């Protein structure tokens, strides 16, 4: 059988289950690194956004995001509080006396000042409430709030 | 039961695929580094602007004189300063909300 | 002469009135400034 | 009627294509998960801002005194409160419209 | 015929209709998963947008989107209604009497108050109508409305 | 003396006038505040 | 001399008239200032 | 004759002294009320 | 004049390319359907908002009384109502221009 | 010549001009569908934009775009016209007579009312012209117009 | 008595004046409202 | 004594004059207040 | 003589009593009208 | 010095690559045509809006009466009309700057 | 040597420098068209932007971009100039004479009118300068300018 | 120990991959050049707009007269001009911050 | 052994470690250029942004970015300073004298002018502080600041 | 004597009747002008 | 009795004076109202 | 009668004053309108 | 007697003629100044 | 008859007084109008 | 002639009265101007 | 005649008053303009 | 007789001269105060 001799001369025993397994193993061992990198980027950006934190390339922005602050306490904003103008603290009403000790001595009875103080407080609330309501209603709109 | 060179050809094809996909991984990591650099630059610019703005307010500072205090205390209701502080707190909350939303939007790069 | 004494008394009374009026106008001016400042804040906010 | 190794080569090519396309499918699912995470973060930020804003209004609350009621009732027409409520309803409708439009725009990620 | 023997030694019977069918079957069985994933993402985002609902990764945002609300009833906005300032309810006009029982007793005839109330109602409408018209006209513009 | 009685009567009449004027000014002030609040809402909205 | 006593009596009567007038004008001016300040403060507040 | 004229002149000056002492008080009260009203109005 | 299996290999390569490119075509059509869905949702949201806004105006409707007509007619020039209608027409034109520009911008998806 | 016999045994006659033609024909027959789909999408979106119309997936938005309107006639905007407040129509000036028939009878001569009506018309134009000019100048800016 | 007749005539004249004044003030108020409405439109537009 | 009766008659005449004057001034002030309030309310409304 | 002076003094004081009783009413009415107008104007 | 079919296989591979890259070129040209169409539509919309806006101003036209000229000339300084024209020129410059910036931004499509 | 005969029977002389050269030549001859198309698109868009001009697909927008204008002369904006309201031209001050020829003849001395005209000119400048400064400072902000 | 033509086929495959990846590199460099051109055009447009705006202010220039100086100096506090200059400095800082943020955003092209 | 002769006739000695090494060497020698180009673009844009500088294609924008300026000193903005309107410099208060030398000579005591100057300075601060605070709070919002 | 007093009293009352008939017209005209000016000013 | 005729003549003279005064005051008040309305309308218009 | 001639002369003088006042008020109104228009432009621009 | 009364009546009427001719000028000047001030104030 | 000449002399004196008064009032009213117009124009300008 | 000396004495008394009145009115007007300017400046400042 | 001299003296005094009033009103106008300019800057900024 | 009338006429004119010299000062002071108040009010 010369056919058998020629076939044996130019033939190498190759197994599909070996070559396929090796190729798939290498491809998986690198695709796992690919997926790990993608998931790491996603986790870093999410942690920066929600305050959990970031590791790796984004670790340097942790200090900056902590300086920005969360909730309503912004350390970047609190710098302006040191220069905030000083304003008087509201106290009880004291009547003002004109010409004290003289025959023309009259004083503001301060009974109507309290009524004015009540209506002023009401107006200040209605203004602040409307401001906050419009502030929340126009968050997606690129407008000052 | 195959001719010579077929296993070598298959190994070469696998090696080519592995090398190309590794190049793709390296480029992906480069892109992620670019995104991190962009975020860092944006936050640094905000911080620098804040530093400049805070400095200007020292020079022009002024205070209400001793007079006019009596009238202000005469009229001032109990909820004036709380309203002013609520407005300031709302301003700060909106600022940090905008910053965080921009950070979230950086997920599309 | 009584006339000059009366005129000086009137001038002194006017001076006292002027001092008291200055004090009261300062107080009322302070009140007006306070009202405008604490309404302007909220108004400009919105 | 072909030489040995050709069917094995064709099977190897098909296997390579299947593996690569499966990798592509996995990466696509990862991207969809990223989009879902982004949407969740955006909505959570909105809800947190709302919670903070609602809390501030408790402290500064005040009411119109018993007086001044007579004059307001003297002048108030029948369609003042309806107009105020219409304005508030318009504000709410525009807010939810903006939110839904942003959700729609998230289709481009 | 040695040619025939050598040809038979190095030949394997391979059918195109088998290899092609197998490859196409595998590729289709995975491409259907690809298309299903794409369509699922599209359906989830559309359901979140129009209120139908989402399943899978986006199922967690269903609660948030239900809290946002649809139409004009926003549960996120209704939180402010509890703190809404109280305002008097409009009633019929009652004349005001000055110095009741005295020789100088005069009262506001309230006949012109109704005319003023009518013109005030008209002005309030024209303001609200213009506000709503401009609100709808400037929806795509990033402006407060 | 009739003069002091007349002066006291005038003072009492003035006090009654002051009370009535305070009531009426409070009512008119309430009306003015209502008008400004319900016009400011729509005006600021737009 | 009855004239001196008469002049003194008229002076005393004028003084008591001045006292009553001062009381009444103080009341009137106080009420006017109160009303004016209330109106001004309310007008500035809204 | 001359004594009568001297007495009349003296009595006249005595009455002028009293008239001035009265008019100063009256005018002072009037001007005080006027200035009080004017300045309380101007200050508010 | 070639060995056996070469034409079969070439046919297999062509078949693979055709199948892959057909998959690409199907995915492209899916993307176009996604864009159409997005446009439909956006326009539907606009229409719904319009419907809600038009409904509110029925309740608060009011009319100018019979009086005050004489004075308004006394002062009203010939070009007041034309100016008001020109303003309204400008508002409508700008609205539809914005809508059409958004539709144009949907070409980048 | 055994060489010739062995060569004939393991050789199949294949023509380049046939395999190349077949592959190119199939690839072109599918790439034409690709290009047709791209051009159809482009045409549909352009027709929606400029009012020509769309066919296929975008055919459902034709009704919505027709409802939006073109030019300045927006059927979505014309809904507000039904609720437009009624305003008096400008007519010629009629003098107002005070105390008609009485010895104190005076009337507004209405000669200066026409001059005021002219200056009022001029002011209304200058306001509307400036509004329209700024409206067109700020179309790309996200501002109300 | 002529005095009461004269007083009643004066009161009637005052009533006629009041009616005419009410009519004229209504007309002028309408004019003012028209001016403000048709200027506010254009002003708020811009 | 006719003087006492004459004084009483003049007092009664003065009282009736005061009554008529009070009626007329009440009418006039009521009309003035109504017109002023109408003008103020309309001015604030627009 | 003296009785005539006493009667004249008494009658004079009686008339002063009546003049005061009249002027109080007149002045009260005038001041009432003035204050009424002033305060109704100030309040509005 | 190679077996039969290798050169034919290499030629087939080159032909496949050339055909695929030509398809890519055709699709690129299609995309460029799409961008040109979008730019044309955007500019056409702007021109149409301008045409409509210019037309409205003819009807409502009005002129200052012969009176009031004396007072205006009495008060008018030498730099009032120059200031008005400077404002108009600034408006036009900003408009064309915005248009050109949008054209520049069309480079990202 | 049967080995030599069999080797010669199944061997074709192929040169690497020919096949490689042919493939690279075809690929370059098509990649040059690719690069030319990319550069042509870039040049067309740049020319449209900076006013140099465009050729090819973008040639149709040359007319539109020329109509928009460059610098500050916009032919689209100059259409509004035809309808610009007419305003008086500023001239020298002429005093106004009241009751000319009568014993009560007084005239405005117009000496203070010039001072007012100077301060008015100053105020108009400070307003226009501030407007232009803020206009340039808020170009990137989507605000009216 | 392989048949003839296998090494030549492998070399041809490597050559094809190298040529294709070089083409990709060339196209990447073309894209970077496009981004640079866009940035240059944007900055040039800003500079030209600035040049035009600065020129207009020469004509309409005016000065406060010699009078009114006494009153202004009578009332002017020590921190008026510092406040005006602080406002101008804030305007300039915000402008350059916006420009730099746009330059940063050009990283997404 | 004819099998050995035939095997030797159609076999070439090829080494995997040579072909793999050559292909990987070429691919790496070109991928390093790819990565260098990417990193160069990144560095150029970052240097333009933060003022470090750019080289290559972006080198031409260095002059433009230097003209824009950094910090708060903008050479583009300083052009407006030359045309800044001239305003008086604040000095100490000088009383104003009416009718100097005449019997009706009165002068403003300037004691209250200083109090007004203090309250004016306070108001100017509170306005500027609020402006700066809102300016920083609305930087991401597309609003004038 | 008594007849003269009666005639004087009658003539006096006749003149009072005429004086009243005149003063009513004069006062009516004055008050009419005053109220006319006041109300035309208030209404505008 | 000449007194009755004299009183009638003075009454007629007073009546004609009243007529002339009414004409003049009507002219003056009409002009004042016209000027005031023109100024008010122009002020509100701009 | 001199009275009617004097009244007619006064009426003519009043008419002349009214004409001159109308001219001057028109001029001043034009000036006010010009000031408001040329300040409103710049103010609304910013 | 009668001639004296006639002369007195004539002289009286002559003086009335002169008094009227004076008062017309005085009243005209006063009213002119008043109206001038009023209208120059109203117009400005 | 000296009375006629005396009346003529008083009339001439009254005429010259009227002339002087007219000159002075023209000066005063011109200054007042100038100041008022300056204040109004400046107030409207800023 | 005592009349001339009496007239001179009354003139001197009038002159000294004028001096005192000038002093008092200068004080009053200065205070009024100061208060008015303070109120105006504060009102414009806020 | 003393009358014309007195009238000329009064006119000269009025002219001096007018000059001083013009100076003072210019100063006060400058102050008002300064206040409005330096408040408008900050107000428009925000 | 005639000398007495001449002396009375002369004395009358002398007194008129003094009355004018007084009234000019009084009227000048009054008008000065009035104009001072008016112009200081108008200027502020």
UniProtKB/Swiss-Prot annotation, chains A, E, J, O, Q:
The chain crosses the membrane at residues 119-139. It is found in: Virion; Host membrane. Residues 1-145 are annotated as: CT. It comes from the Viruses. Belongs to the inovirus G3P protein family. Consists of 3 domains (N1/D1, N2/D2, and CT) separated by glycine-rich repeats and a C-terminal transmembrane segment. The N2 domain interacts with the F pilus, whereas the N1 domain forms a complex with the C-terminal domain of TolA at later stages of the infection process. The C-terminal domain is required for release of viral particles from the host bacterial membrane and proper integration of G3P and G6P proteins in the virion. Interacts with G6P; this interaction is required for proper integration of G3P and G6P into the virion. Interacts with G8P. Interacts with the tip of the host pilus. Interacts (via N-terminus) with host TolA. Interacts (via transmembrane domain) with host TolQ (via 2nd and 3rd transmembrane domains); this interaction allows the phage translocation across the host inner membrane. Interacts (via transmembrane domain) with host TolR (via transmembrane domain); this interaction allows the phage translocation across the host inner membrane. This is Attachment protein G3P.
Swiss-Prot record, chains B, D, I, N, P:
Keywords: Host membrane, Membrane, Transmembrane, Transmembrane helix, Viral penetration into host cytoplasm, Viral penetration into host cytoplasm via pilus retraction, Virion, Virus entry into host cell. Disulfide bonds: none annotated. The keyword Transmembrane helix applies. The keyword Transmembrane helix applies. It comes from the Viruses. Its main location: virion. The chain crosses the membrane at residues 2-22, 35-55, 79-99. One of its GO terms (cellular component) is host cell membrane. It holds the Pfam family DUF5455. It is found in: Virion; Host membrane. Interacts with G3P; this interaction is required for proper integration of G3P and G6P into the virion. Plays essential roles both in the entry of the viral genome into the bacterial host and in budding process. The formation of the G3P-G6P complex termed adsorption complex is essential for correct termination of filamentous phage assembly. This is Head virion protein G6P. The lineage of its organism: Viruses, Monodnaviria, Loebvirae, Hofneiviricota, Faserviricetes. The gene is VI.
UniProtKB/Swiss-Prot annotation, chains C, F, G, K, L, S, T, V, W, X:
Its main location: virion. It is found in: Virion; Host cell inner membrane. It is a single-pass type I membrane protein. Residues 42-46 are cytoplasmic. GO terms for cellular component: helical viral capsid; host cell plasma membrane; membrane. It comes from the Viruses. Keywords: Capsid protein, Helical capsid protein, Host cell inner membrane, Host cell membrane, Host membrane, Membrane, Signal, Transmembrane, Transmembrane helix, Virion. Residues 1-20 are periplasmic. The keyword ATP-binding does not apply. The chain crosses the membrane at residues 21-41. Belongs to the inovirus capsid protein family. Self assembles to form a helical capsid wrapping up the viral genomic DNA. The capsid displays a filamentous structure with a length of 760-1950 nm and a width of 6-8 nm. The virion assembly and budding take place at the host inner membrane. Homomultimerizes. There are about 2,700 copies of this protein in the phage capsid. This is Capsid protein G8P. It comes from Enterobacteria phage M13 (Bacteriophage M13). The gene is VIII. The chain holds residues 28 to 73 of 73 of the full protein.
Curated annotation (Swiss-Prot), chains H, M, R, U, Y:
Its main location: virion. It comes from the Viruses. It is found in: Virion; Host cell inner membrane. Keywords: Capsid protein, Helical capsid protein, Host cell inner membrane, Host cell membrane, Host membrane, Membrane, Signal, Transmembrane, Transmembrane helix, Virion. Residues 1-18 are periplasmic. Residues 40-44 are cytoplasmic. The chain crosses the membrane at residues 19-39. GO terms for cellular component: helical viral capsid; host cell plasma membrane; membrane. Coiled coil: none annotated. The keyword DNA repair does not apply. It is a single-pass type I membrane protein. Belongs to the inovirus capsid protein family. Self assembles to form a helical capsid wrapping up the viral genomic DNA. The capsid displays a filamentous structure with a length of 760-1950 nm and a width of 6-8 nm. The virion assembly and budding take place at the host inner membrane. Homomultimerizes. There are about 2,700 copies of this protein in the phage capsid. This is Capsid protein G8P. It comes from Enterobacteria phage M13.
């Amino acid at each position: 059988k010369m056919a058998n001799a020629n076939k044996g001369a130019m033939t190498e025993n190759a197994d599909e289950n070996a070559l396929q397994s090796d190729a798939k193993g290498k491809l998986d061992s690198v695709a796992t690194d690919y997926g790990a990198a993608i998931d790491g980027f996603i986790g870093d950006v999410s942690g920066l956004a929600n305050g959990n934190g970031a590791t790796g390339d984004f670790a340097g922005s942790n200090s900056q995001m902590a300086q920005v602050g969360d909730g309503d306490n912004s350390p970047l904003m609190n710098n302006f509080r040191q220069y905030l103008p000083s304003l008087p603290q509201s106290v009880e009403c004291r009547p003002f006396v004109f010409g004290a000790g003289k025959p023309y001595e009259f004083s503001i009875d301060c009974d109507k000042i309290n009524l004015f103080r009540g209506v002023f407080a009401f107006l200040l609330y209605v203004a602040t409430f409307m401001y906050v309501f419009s502030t929340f209603a126009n968050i997606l709109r690129n407008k000052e709030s | 039961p195959v001719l010579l060179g077929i296993p070598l050809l298959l190994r070469f094809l696998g090696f080519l695929l592995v090398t190309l996909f590794g190049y793709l991984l390296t480029f992906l990591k480069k892109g992620f580094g670019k995104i991190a650099i962009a975020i860092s630059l944006f936050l640094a610019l905000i911080i620098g602007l804040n530093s400049i703005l805070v400095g200007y307010l020292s020079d022009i500072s002024a205070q209400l004189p001793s007079d006019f205090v009596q009238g202000v205390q005469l009229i001032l209701p109990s909820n004036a300063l709380p309203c002013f502080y609520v407005i300031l707190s709302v301003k700060a909350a909106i600022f940090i909300f905008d910053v965080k939303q921009k950070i979230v939007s950086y997920l599309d790069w | 002469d009584p006339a000059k004494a009366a005129f000086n008394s009137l001038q002194a009374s006017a001076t006292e009135y002027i001092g008291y009026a200055w004090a009261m106008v300062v107080v009322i001016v302070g009140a007006t400034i306070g009202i405008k400042l604490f309404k302007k804040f909220t108004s400009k906010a919105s």
